[PDB]
Design an enzyme around this catalytic site. Structure first.
Site, mmCIF file in Angstrom:
data_model
loop_
_atom_site.group_PDB
_atom_site.id
_atom_site.type_symbol
_atom_site.label_atom_id
_atom_site.label_comp_id
_atom_site.label_asym_id
_atom_site.label_seq_id
_atom_site.Cartn_x
_atom_site.Cartn_y
_atom_site.Cartn_z
ATOM 1 N N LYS A 52 -5.319 7.941 -4.715
ATOM 2 C CA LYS A 52 -6.136 6.922 -5.356
ATOM 3 C C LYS A 52 -5.548 5.539 -5.014
ATOM 4 O O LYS A 52 -5.050 4.821 -5.872
ATOM 5 C CB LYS A 52 -6.198 7.181 -6.870
ATOM 6 N N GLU A 63 -15.155 2.545 -4.959
ATOM 7 C CA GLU A 63 -14.856 1.578 -3.905
ATOM 8 C C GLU A 63 -15.956 0.534 -3.795
ATOM 9 O O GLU A 63 -15.691 -0.625 -3.499
ATOM 10 C CB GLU A 63 -14.624 2.287 -2.574
ATOM 11 N N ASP A 94 -15.319 8.552 -6.383
ATOM 12 C CA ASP A 94 -14.697 7.826 -5.299
ATOM 13 C C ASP A 94 -15.607 6.929 -4.461
ATOM 14 O O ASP A 94 -15.306 5.750 -4.264
ATOM 15 C CB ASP A 94 -13.948 8.804 -4.431
HETATM 16 C C1 LIG Z 1 -10.917 1.893 -2.329
HETATM 17 C C2 LIG Z 1 -11.024 3.131 -1.574
HETATM 18 C C3 LIG Z 1 -9.752 4.021 -1.252
HETATM 19 C C4 LIG Z 1 -8.637 3.174 -0.666
HETATM 20 O O1 LIG Z 1 -9.221 4.483 -2.472
HETATM 21 C C5 LIG Z 1 -10.148 5.297 -0.471
HETATM 22 O O2 LIG Z 1 -11.028 5.951 -1.068
HETATM 23 C C6 LIG Z 1 -10.787 4.982 0.865
HETATM 24 O O3 LIG Z 1 -11.943 5.324 1.070
HETATM 25 O O4 LIG Z 1 -10.191 4.367 1.711
HETATM 26 MN MN LIG Z 2 -10.719 6.087 -3.276
HETATM 27 MN MN LIG Z 3 -13.078 6.508 -0.539
#
Ligand SMILES: CC[C@@](C)(O)[C@@H](O)C(=O)O
Ligand SMILES: [Mn+2]
Ligand SMILES: [Mn+2]
Ligand SMILES: NC1NC[NH2+]c2c1ncn2[C@@H]1O[C@H](COP(=O)(O)OP(=O)(O)OC[C@H]2O[C@@H](O)[C@H](O)[C@@H]2O)[C@@H](O)[C@H]1OP(=O)(O)O
Ligand SMILES: N[C@H]1NC[NH2+]c2c1ncn2[C@@H]1O[C@H](COP(=O)(O)OP(=O)(O)OC[C@H]2O[C@@H](O)[C@H](O)[C@@H]2O)[C@@H](O)[C@H]1OP(=O)(O)O
Ligand SMILES: CC[C@@](C)(O)[C@@H](O)C(=O)O
Ligand SMILES: [Mn+2]
Ligand SMILES: [Mn+2]
Lengths: 514, 510
Positions: free
Chosen positions: B167, B234, B230
């Site tokens: 994370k 982001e 996720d």
């Molecule tokens: C903000 C997103 C990250 C850094 O946690 C990861 O999910 C990615 O996709 O690179």
């Molecule tokens: Mn992430």
């Molecule tokens: Mn991600």
């Protein structure tokens, strides 16, 4: 695949137009054709117009007016959902219970021979089974957008086998379809061009019913397409040059101009007034080449810098948007958005908000408060370059994706200048965007920011870094075969320009101001 | 996801009356890796984007300390430019730790598929065909399952499928691990999932992988809960929303007469510095409480006006992610990076060459060491409001508190923001995955526009303060939960400067 679509009519005269060497068949409109409506509508006693959004008010009134002139006995009845607050508006337009022309949506559908499903696209997506169950066997379902087909495809479904399915899609906002038709009564008619489709035909009447419907709307010319080609170009177009992109362009440029010392007044004139005034007027009757040729020699250089820097970044977003529309991603987002207008899952309702209460629109109100009638706006070269580059990029995306020139030109040029832009000249971005469908309103809100950001991040940065002008892009624009085609289509345009001002009453009720 | 580990110690944490089981990390657990990695002789790390460089090195470092004979081999496609980079990280062909992608997949017992999500979507069949029977496929994101679901498909029934999802950005996974070497470890919390388990080795292999990365704590989830939270996160507070916020507020502040220097400080510097530092170790409540009475009123005006407009976009984003719309858009976006259908290629462009970012370069050029910016109350209100709205969306959509807190709070302050403080929005955004970079670009504009159109307009119109909303923020159970998680946080703050050498090669500067 097929780019062009031919058809047969035993009622109307089909004409050929050659666009960039491509023959396309169309049907010219005119009030003189109204006497042919009874023949086109054989087997139709009642046309049920479902909904009262932006299209229904206009289509219903135009149809009734046309049928009245034709001395037809066909009944145009408005059907509304139980929780509708649109009954009063329908009565104001002349549709009422005492005449048997206003009632419940399901009861109206059940008694109709032709059903015009003019409710929100998300509503169609979540209520089609009940619409289907109420259709009379062997009747005709008419759509003004192919969205429902896209939704059905995502579910591995299709329309019932016992009904014809057609579409007549005005390439312009409902308020303009009505207004131009009204202005046309003084001459031999006026209106908004429409595309039509025959998805399913169970008896042979489908084509003439679609053509009659279009003619009755006042369409100067009607061309053929398919439900899929229509939703792919349409959902995309409104997010592109028609609403989303033009909004993002004006926000981006207004900010750039004011940052650089230009007064707010001038920045507004040089963006919105320019685009909705002289740019649109020139493109409407003379074309983009005439527009470029009306620039001074120095102006052409500024236009070139803007066009060169803006073309590809605009295409990037357009390309993305088109693929999201074709894949089903965007259609599904619109369906889910409609559900979020109501409370569910312990979360609040989120109806669309206002988009014209920010800085540049507040400036726009002040500019208009003292703007004299008949103002043509300035032809600011840099603005013209950005706008025309985006228009040309959209045209290229549609060509590469497989659409006909009639579809491309209406969706990327004619509609912007003859239907939409006049509303933004009249009262800003909301008066334009918010008079369109829920799908278009959501699309404009979702994509305008994308165009703003990419133009700021890439195009404007390139100009500020002294990027060389891609003269090949300029030459391509100047030699583009779309220009001659635009000229051919322009010959089919009535000599009536839409007259709309800020206190227009022919717009959505929530948009009326005085 | 209830799990049982044979090698590691499972512990309970109670977050707002909800018992969740996690596995605490620590370098002291490294000697347990050989037992965790039963049947693993080779770990094939496929790819060399943002995660692979970090993970491969942390794994190798941990295995060495564990005195393990497991080989970490990097697998790259055709004539990839990443070979040189991999060699620079200590991986070579002569030592059998660098080789061809397919050959690496074929000989590996644990395959870490760390290539772009869209590439996974368009090449999973080739990946699957190279997996040995009863080998293990490891993902650091659940995206691939979402894609397979859209096709009505699933993974092969002869392999195990697990996930260890840090994370935080890959460069932070490496940097914190390095900083934690002499203090029994430091790192980025990770979530783990076991989608398929052929023989019972899956759980411990995933936990070993996570512990070896340096995860202070590892919490359980599923591939679907992970991709839903996720892909959304982001685009939300982590990258897209924070970018939209600073752009919209910088514009407002400058329009109001604030100098560009101060407008940048009061937005970007404020959020990535003092705000992040406060939330990181003390919490959002502490941040609010530190404000003067006038500050609290400004905070409330910003919060009250920004909360729902922020939720509007978050709600939309979440649903597009769960429905499959966003995943499909990311897959198609990957294809447009190349020429096809007679159209040009459109690789991602730069997002930090505009006005406010050029100002930021100027601001940082004279920024003294240890400067964490000003605490601007209005900015705190907008930011915290969006943070709280995201938490609520995830709560209503069914996510666990460990996942909600990491995806909406911890990652922002401990992993991401430090990079924007160091060198602007690109240094943060572009060091994340292809999927995150696309998401940030697509959604940042949405947050900017809605805040400009609704939130700020409400403030200018004198909208009354929504007292119940403010009251609920102050009594929200997430605050105590955040405090509990913070107790598991090592006393190590990530050290990142503009010339960081642990970032993507293309982002390394002077
Ligand atoms: C903000 C997103 C990250 C850094 O946690 C990861 O999910 C990615 O996709 O690179
Ligand atoms: Mn992430
Ligand atoms: Mn991600
Ligand atoms: N078609 C392909 N076939 C194989 N590999 C591949 C393809 N396309 C991109 N790639 C590779 O993908 C890498 C770039 O992808 P990236 O998006 O930066 O990759 P990461 O940020 O590292 O993310 C990897 C996983 O961790 C999670 O955080 C993510 O959600 C994802 O599931 C590069 O190494 C690139 O190869 P190189 O350029 O290095 O050779
Ligand atoms: N669940 C529903 N059941 C029935 N009807 C319905 C529902 N939801 C929205 N609606 C109706 O939908 C109308 C508002 O929709 P809108 O989006 O503004 O509708 P329009 O712009 O008029 O577009 C209609 C069709 O023409 C094409 O141009 C469009 O793409 C679409 O296919 C209102 O009349 C509203 O009803 P009223 O508010 O008037 O009652
Ligand atoms: C710009 C969009 C319109 C007016 O053509 C129509 O498609 C709609 O959705 O309302
Ligand atoms: Mn349209
Ligand atoms: Mn439309």
């Amino acid at each position: 695949s097929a780019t062009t679509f031919d058809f047969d009519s035993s009622v109307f005269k089909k004409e050929k137009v050659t666009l960039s060497g491509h023959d396309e068949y169309i049907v010219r409109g005119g009030r003189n054709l109204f006497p042919l409506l009874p023949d086109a509508f054989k087997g139709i006693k009642q046309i049920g117009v479902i909904g009262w959004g932006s299209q229904a008010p206009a289509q219903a009134q135009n149809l009734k007016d046309s049928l009245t002139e034709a001395k037809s006995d066909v009944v145009v009845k408005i059907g509304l959902r139980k929780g509708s607050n649109s009954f009063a508006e329908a009565r104001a337009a002349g549709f009422s219970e005492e005449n048997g022309t206003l009632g419940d949506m399901w009861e109206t559908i059940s008694g109709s021979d032709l059903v015009l499903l003019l409710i929100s696209d998300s509503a169609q997506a979540d209520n089609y089974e009940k619409v289907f169950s109420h259709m009379k066997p062997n009747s005709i379902l008419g759509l003004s957008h192919g969205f429902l087909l896209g939704h059905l495809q995502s579910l591995g479904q299709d329309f019932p086998k016992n009904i014809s399915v057609i579409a007549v899609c005005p390439k312009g906002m409902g308020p303009s379809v009505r207004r131009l038709y009204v202005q046309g009564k003084e001459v031999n008619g006026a209106g908004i061009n429409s595309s039509f489709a025959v998805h399913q035909d169970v008896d042979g009447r489908a084509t003439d019913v679609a053509l009659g419907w279009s003619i009755a709307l006042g369409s100067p010319f009607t061309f053929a397409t398919t439900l899929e080609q229509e939703y792919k170009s349409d959902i995309f177009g409104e997010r592109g040059i028609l609403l989303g992109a033009v909004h993002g362009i004006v926000e981006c440029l207004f900010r750039r101009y004011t940052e650089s010392g230009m007064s707010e007044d001038l920045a507004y004139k040089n963006t919105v007034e320019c685009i909705t005034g002289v740019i649109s007027k020139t493109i409407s009757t003379k074309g983009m080449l005439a527009l470029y040729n009306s620039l001074s020699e120095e102006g052409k250089k500024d236009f070139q810098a803007a066009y060169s820097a803006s073309y590809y970044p605009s295409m990037d977003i357009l390309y993305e948007c088109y693929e999201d529309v074709a894949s089903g991603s965007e259609i599904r987002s619109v369906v889910l958005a409609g559900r979020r207008f109501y409370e569910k899952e312990g979360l609040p309702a989120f109806p669309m908000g206002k988009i014209d209460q920010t800085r540049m629109w507040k400036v726009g109100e002040k500019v208009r408060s003292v703007r004299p009638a008949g103002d043509l706006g300035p032809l600011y070269p840099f603005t013209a370059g950005v706008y025309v580059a985006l228009m040309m990029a959209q045209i290229e995306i549609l060509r590469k994706k497989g659409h006909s020139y009639s579809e491309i030109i209406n969706e990327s040029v004619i509609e912007a200048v003859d239907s939409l832009n006049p509303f933004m000249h009249a009262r800003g971005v909301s008066f334009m965007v918010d008079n369109c469908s829920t799908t278009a309103r959501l699309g404009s809100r979702k994509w305008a920011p994308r165009f703003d950001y990419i133009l700021s991040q890439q195009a404007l940065v390139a100009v500020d870094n002294g990027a060389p002008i891609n003269q090949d892009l300029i030459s391509n624009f100047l030699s583009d075969p779309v220009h001659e085609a635009i000229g051919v289509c322009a010959q089919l345009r009535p000599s009536v320009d839409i007259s709309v001002t800020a206190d227009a009453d022919f717009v959505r009720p929530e948009l009326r101001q005085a």
